[PDB]
Amino acid sequence: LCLDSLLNGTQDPKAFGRVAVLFGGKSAEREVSLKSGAMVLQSLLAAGVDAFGIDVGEDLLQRLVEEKIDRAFIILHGRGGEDGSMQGLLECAGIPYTGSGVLASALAMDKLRTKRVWLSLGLPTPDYAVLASEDDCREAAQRLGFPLIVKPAHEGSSIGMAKVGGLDELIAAWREAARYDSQVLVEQWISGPEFTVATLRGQVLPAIRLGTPHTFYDYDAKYLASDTRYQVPCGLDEAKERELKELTARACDALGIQGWGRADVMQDAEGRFWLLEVNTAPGMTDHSLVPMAARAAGLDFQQLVLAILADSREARG
Amino acid sequence: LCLDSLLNGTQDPKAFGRVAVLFGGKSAEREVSLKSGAMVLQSLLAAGVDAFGIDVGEDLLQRLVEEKIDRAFIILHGRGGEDGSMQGLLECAGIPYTGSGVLASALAMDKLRTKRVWLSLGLPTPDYAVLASEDDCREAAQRLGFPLIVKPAHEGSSIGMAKVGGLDELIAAWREAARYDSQVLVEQWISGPEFTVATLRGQVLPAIRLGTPHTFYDYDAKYLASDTRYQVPCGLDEAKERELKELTARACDALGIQGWGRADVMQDAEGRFWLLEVNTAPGMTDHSLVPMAARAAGLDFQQLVLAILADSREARG
Ligand SMILES: Nc1ncnc2c1ncn2[C@@H]1O[C@H](COP(=O)(O)OP(=O)(O)OP(=O)(O)O)[C@@H](O)[C@H]1O
Ligand SMILES: Nc1ncnc2c1ncn2[C@@H]1O[C@H](COP(=O)(O)OP(=O)(O)OP(=O)(O)O)[C@@H](O)[C@H]1O
Ligand SMILES: [Mg+2]
Ligand SMILES: [Mg+2]
Ligand SMILES: [Mg+2]
Ligand SMILES: [Mg+2]
16 A cells, blocks of 8 residues: 555656656766666656656756756756755746755755754754864864764765774865865764665655675765675664654654655664765665665666656645 | 945956846746846946846746856845745856855745744744644634734745734635745734844844834835835844844854845844844845845945845855
8 A cells, every 4th residue: 555655646657748867967976877867767768758868067058948848857966966956947947856845955965954953853963073174173083082984064975985083084084075065074983784764755665774894885885896785674673673764754854855865874882873864866876775775665666766756746845 | 344344346347247137037026026126237237237137037048048147146036036946046057146045045935944943043033833724723823822923934025914813814814825825824923113134245234123004014014105114223222233133143144144135023022032034135126125224334225236246256055
């Protein structure tokens, strides 16, 4: 009955009209978005959807006035795609689109604002600091200890991220992340199992436990390595996995996520869950996680992209 | 010295290039935005700026690919203009623009989200309820009492608003506001002096006290009536006006306002201030308030629009 609700308006691919798959862009995750778009476009075409691709670049507005578009599938990654900017352009152009609206996308792209919202609601997210100075690195070390994990506030795909074990590599990781974003945050390192929880049309999909011999789930482990471990069902018991899913729903509703999304959650040695971030246009590569979660629920890749598309027939927030 | 910082990059009008004044649109405040744009455009032209106007409509993307534009002056009012959507379109198009960024504009357009952020920071804003039912109207009445003020969450210019003194007109005002927005909120009526506080380039301008023989500061009193009262300096003492200005700065920084903006604040019988809302593209008509506040600080209309333009030469958030 739940899977019936997920496939609600997926029966007629022709009913969606001409669908523009938006991918590429000029963000650091461009290469990831190129493969996600190729997956989504090929999937929509095999399903019988009148779908075409658009490599988002300096060409975009020219293509929006030339091409007829009944609906846009946003599968861009990072700034210029997941930060509400592309969402606002499509609303001005009067084109309906997939995923979260302008406010939710802009908020979820900002890891600092996202964590700040979660804290005001009493949701767990690792203690952190904002780094714009070598003195800031020293204060964060004195208050939070080691190890730490440094990340730009607005990036994805573990780009510009580093786990640091001392002040020496903390300062080097801050300078590296600052080449991607003047907004640099550092979090307390959570030591324990890593989970990721996909949500689709207000339903929380099966959780996936992630493992890699790397120091963390970095760009290489996500997209290039062969020894990354994916486990579904996750080793959690029914009470613990239910707790994780209810935490994911609250964390996504806190930001206003719509259509679909993915939450990345850590668990510590005492069983506590810690929210890291939420993605509003998760990767759709053949290495990606939301497709794995969809299969566990029973949807193949074509049903998944059709479900994301059918959800957009209503209104964003 | 403060006024020097306000006029920082206003000396060379030719230095801004070709400036597109964006006005009109399809929101309920279209007629207001048409007059604000006419004021801003005429002001920029008399200052020696290579400025042209664009009536935002179904024409927009076609005009953005035809016209050369070095900088956009956003003077649209309401949804499609102040809600981050136009801001996101201009960022995708690579055009710098005036005012708050995508996240701040989208947040400040939403009165519910704005009040919700203020509450988490301990800033004062009237107790409220969300109305989507006649039972909701009854619960709000039982909890908040009378009188009340009903408003759509995303409107401006007092459109769809009504002060209600009983359950009969509460329910009628809810149905009327729901024709503009499925998001309807009702606030506790604050009885006392009304102030409005303009901010420009991180500086808080002199406060203006507002008075009208109407039941409240409605669309008619704002734009059509002759007996609306504007008082600058406001009757507050130095300690009280300083308190109001520091509250305005905190309320604007809470949402991420940039460039300029205006806050509307009520004061009750016991001297307490209550934040109503923040506008990220305030009206610029000859009835409008930000020009009055600028004159009190020493800037005429041309210096004001040049200052808004010079601030945009940096980066939005
Ligand atoms: N506080 C933390 N404690 C432990 N590991 C962490 C922490 N924050 C991040 N990580 C690790 O770094 C990885 C990337 O972190 P995060 O998901 O916040 O970054 P992202 O680049 O935005 O990711 P994505 O590819 O999902 O867009 C996580 O999958 C996790 O392995
Ligand atoms: N809680 C309240 N108590 C008393 N008066 C109120 C209250 N809320 C609103 N008002 C009155 O209604 C007017 C319009 O309210 P508000 O500024 O929230 O609406 P708006 O339509 O978004 O305004 P604007 O023209 O500034 O965009 C205020 O100027 C004030 O006179
Ligand atoms: Mg991410
Ligand atoms: Mg992640
Ligand atoms: Mg307003
Ligand atoms: Mg107002």
